[PDB]
Amino acid sequence: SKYSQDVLQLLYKNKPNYISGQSIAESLNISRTAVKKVIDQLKLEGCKIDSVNHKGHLLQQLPDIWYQGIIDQYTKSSALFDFSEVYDSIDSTQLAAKKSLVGNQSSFFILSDEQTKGRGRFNRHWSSSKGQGLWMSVVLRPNVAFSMISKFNLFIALGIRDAIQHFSQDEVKVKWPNDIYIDNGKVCGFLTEMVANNDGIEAIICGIGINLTQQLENFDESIRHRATSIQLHDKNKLDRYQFLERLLQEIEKRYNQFLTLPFSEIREEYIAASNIWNRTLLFTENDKQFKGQAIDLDYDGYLIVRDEAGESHRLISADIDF
Amino acid sequence: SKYSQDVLQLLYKNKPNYISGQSIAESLNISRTAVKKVIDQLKLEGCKIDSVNHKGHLLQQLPDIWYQGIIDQYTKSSALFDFSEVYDSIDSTQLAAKKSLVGNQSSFFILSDEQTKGRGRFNRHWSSSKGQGLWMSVVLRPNVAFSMISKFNLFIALGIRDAIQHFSQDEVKVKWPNDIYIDNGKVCGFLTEMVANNDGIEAIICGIGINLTQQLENFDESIRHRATSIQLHDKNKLDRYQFLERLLQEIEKRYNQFLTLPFSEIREEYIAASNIWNRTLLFTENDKQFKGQAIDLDYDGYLIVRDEAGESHRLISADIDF
Ligand SMILES: Cc1ccc2oc(=O)n(CCCCn3cc(CCCCC[C@@H]4SC[C@@H]5NC(=O)N[C@@H]54)nn3)c2c1
Numbered sequence: 001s002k003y004s005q006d007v008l009q010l011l012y013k014n015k016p017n018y019i020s021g022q023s024i025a026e027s028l029n030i031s032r033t034a035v036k037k038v039i040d041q042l043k044l045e046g047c048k049i050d051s052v053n054h055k056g057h058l059l060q061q062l063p064d065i066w067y068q069g070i071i072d073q074y075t076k077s078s079a080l081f082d083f084s085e086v087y088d089s090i091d092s093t094q095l096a097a098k099k100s101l102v103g104n105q106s107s108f109f110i111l112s113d114e115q116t117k118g119r120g121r122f123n124r125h126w127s128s129s130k131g132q133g134l135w136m137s138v139v140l141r142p143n144v145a146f147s148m149i150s151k152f153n154l155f156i157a158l159g160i161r162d163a164i165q166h167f168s169q170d171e172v173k174v175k176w177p178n179d180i181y182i183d184n185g186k187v188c189g190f191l192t193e194m195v196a197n198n199d200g201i202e203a204i205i206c207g208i209g210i211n212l213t214q215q216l217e218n219f220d221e222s223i224r225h226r227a228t229s230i231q232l233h234d235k236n237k238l239d240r241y242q243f244l245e246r247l248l249q250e251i252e253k254r255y256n257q258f259l260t261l262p263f264s265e266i267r268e269e270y271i272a273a274s275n276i277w278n279r280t281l282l283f284t285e286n287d288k289q290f291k292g293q294a295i296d297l298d299y300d301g302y303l304i305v306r307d308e309a310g311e312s313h314r315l316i317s318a319d320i321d322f
Numbered sequence: 323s324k325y326s327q328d329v330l331q332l333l334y335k336n337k338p339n340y341i342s343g344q345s346i347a348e349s350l351n352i353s354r355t356a357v358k359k360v361i362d363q364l365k366l367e368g369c370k371i372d373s374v375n376h377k378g379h380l381l382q383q384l385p386d387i388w389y390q391g392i393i394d395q396y397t398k399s400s401a402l403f404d405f406s407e408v409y410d411s412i413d414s415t416q417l418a419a420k421k422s423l424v425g426n427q428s429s430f431f432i433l434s435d436e437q438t439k440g441r442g443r444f445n446r447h448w449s450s451s452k453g454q455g456l457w458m459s460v461v462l463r464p465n466v467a468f469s470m471i472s473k474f475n476l477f478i479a480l481g482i483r484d485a486i487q488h489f490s491q492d493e494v495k496v497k498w499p500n501d502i503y504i505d506n507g508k509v510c511g512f513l514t515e516m517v518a519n520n521d522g523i524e525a526i527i528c529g530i531g532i533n534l535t536q537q538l539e540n541f542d543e544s545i546r547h548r549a550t551s552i553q554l555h556d557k558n559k560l561d562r563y564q565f566l567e568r569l570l571q572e573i574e575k576r577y578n579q580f581l582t583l584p585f586s587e588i589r590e591e592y593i594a595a596s597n598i599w600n601r602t603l604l605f606t607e608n609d610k611q612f613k614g615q616a617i618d619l620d621y622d623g624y625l626i627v628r629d630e631a632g633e634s635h636r637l638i639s640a641d642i643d644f
């Protein structure tokens with residue numbers, strides 16, 4: 001109700017310390033027995049809080065639900081982002097981000113527990129089941145030319161990857177240009193779009209879907225061989241909030257690199273992180289489809305491909321299948 | 323009121339024919355004396371309709387106000403556009419277009435009588451006074467790469483120019499890349515923006531401001547030497563609706579050319595239409611500013627400039643001053 005996030009904010013702010021019902025009640029100028037009432041609900045909503053008499057409450061562990069209130073804490077103390085929007089369900093964070101950026105120069109991100117109408121590249125359906133993954137759009141505001149998009153996409157990839165890795169027992173690879181894998185399962189897909197004109201980019205909108213807490217059971221049967229989740233590669237439970245934290249951390253890192261360094265500078269690294277070498281790839285281009293091999297990513301972000309018929313292409317993007 | 327546009331639609335549809343109050347009343351299932359009531363208002367609103375007893379009404383001439391109802395008639399019978407939005411006042415058609423395009427593949431345009439917060443390039447203030455100019459954003463949906471924006475901007479320019487010319491006694495020139503002049507007055511400025519990602523453009527948003535019905539009196543005193551309007555170069559009154567008509571006509575023309583022809587094919591023409599040759603131009607680039615001369619537009623839309631210090635640049639865009 002009206003005060004839930006508020007209570008939550010305090011519980012989060014105050015860690016690893018207990019706070020009294022009383023104390024909360026005076027912050028939010030409401031009754032002591034209201035606070036007891038707002039707590040019990042959170043607990044029922046799958047919050048783990050320790051209540052100790054004469055001592056008060058301690059927010060121990062959070063459920064697989066995004067709470068605005070907590071997110072605000074991430075936003076408050078952040079160079080990069082002005083604010084955030086958090087939903088339990090929406091059509092698409094990317095759609096919402098696309099609307100929210102109009103007419104303003106803010107930087108912000110959107111998060112939703114479920115997306116009812118999530119879309120990937122080429123307007124593909126992207127499956128965004130409730131409480132199971134991170135579905136986020138990020139808006140940043142680099143002052144640069146529109147051509148510079150592709151570079152963003154490459155830098156940001158390593159960002160996302162590092163974040164995922166740091167929680168994975170196994171090797172986490174990028175599949176240029178838009179996809180992250182753990183061994184054989186796609187664990188994430190992301191996409192970098194812009195509003196821009198000739199004078200430069202007005203905004204970057206970076207959509208990111210990462211499967212967090214799935215069982216193969218939860219994955220569709222017709223894709224269950226090539227999909228995975230972060231949880232399936234961490235012996236420890238996966239705290240979405242801990243993970244969101246590291247995700248923003250590396251986004252920032254890579255965002256700054258994108259601004260201050262040329263692609264040549266991360267190219268090697270990108271390379272070692274990629275999983276497309278030494279195997280045969282099925283490219284699509286509209287009606288046409290063909291196989292070929294990944295020769296090299298050039299100093300400019302372009303992939304050097306040698307098609308099955310021996311011809312070299314230099315490509316800025318492509319959709320590749322294994 | 324509730325039925326104004328409807329009456330208007332009929333009046334427009336039926337030209338050059340009179341329609342009876344009766345006939346209208348049965349189309350729109352309302353009372354005969356309501357219709358008399360809805361007409362008198364339109365007349366007061368500065369519509370010129372002929373009412374003739376036993377005969378009915380003829381829509382003769384329209385005021386300097388955009389009516390949704392009429393616009394719908396343009397939209398209904400049009401290959402290019404799905405619908406349109408019409409306002410008497412909004413923050414910015416470009417802003418609105420930017421919102422309306424999200425989550426759908428429509429093609430459409432927006433029109434407003436006044437823009438309270440209209441913006442040009444580099445987020446400049448653009449003055450959009452009530453009932454005096456055409457303030458429009460167009461959204462089209464070409465299937466192409468984002469790089470292809472600049473080409474759009476060039477093609478569309480000739481479109482706009484032809485439209486203006488056809489109503490001008492005097493020579494109407496383009497000032498690359500974003501501005502239209504009649505002799506010494508800026509008569510229009512336009513701007514081509516996109517939402518896109520690496521796989522291609524998701525939408526083009528083309529904002530267009532054209533001064534229609536100004537007196538130098540109406541123009542600010544500190545710009546009155548370099549601003550003009552279409553009316554100030556037509557001895558005949560300027561029908562915004564007649565003009566909108568020709569504008570859409572040529573937009574379509576040039577849109578198709580943009581899709582079917584390489585820039586080389588209109589380059590010559592663009593050239594003869596341009597007004598930047600044989601004089602000295604002040605370019606701005608951020609902090610830096612310098613003079614130089616326009617040597618050539620290359621087959622690829624880029625301007626060849628020779629700066630005051632003898633160095634050639636090849637430029638995709640620039641803001642030029644006279
Ligand atoms: C869930 C699932 C599991 C296994 C799968 O195996 C598949 O082939 N697919 C179908 C997808 C094919 C691969 N692909 C990748 C991309 C780029 C990523 C798009 C960013 C998405 C983010 S989510 C928050 C934001 N809001 C939004 O609307 N979009 C973005 N596009 N297509 C699978 C889907």
Ligand SMILES: Cc1ccc2oc(=O)n(CCCCn3cc(CCCCC[C@@H]4SC[C@@H]5NC(=O)N[C@@H]54)nn3)c2c1
Nearest residue numbers: 414416440441442443449457458511512513529530531
């Ligand atoms: C009215 C006036 C008269 C004389 C002037 O002399 C000046 O220097 N200026 C200031 C402008 C400087 C030149 N410039 C051109 C451009 C590109 C055009 C932008 C499209 C505008 C359209 S309108 C409907 C749509 N909605 C929207 O918000 N924008 C677009 N940017 N800057 C003048 C303004």
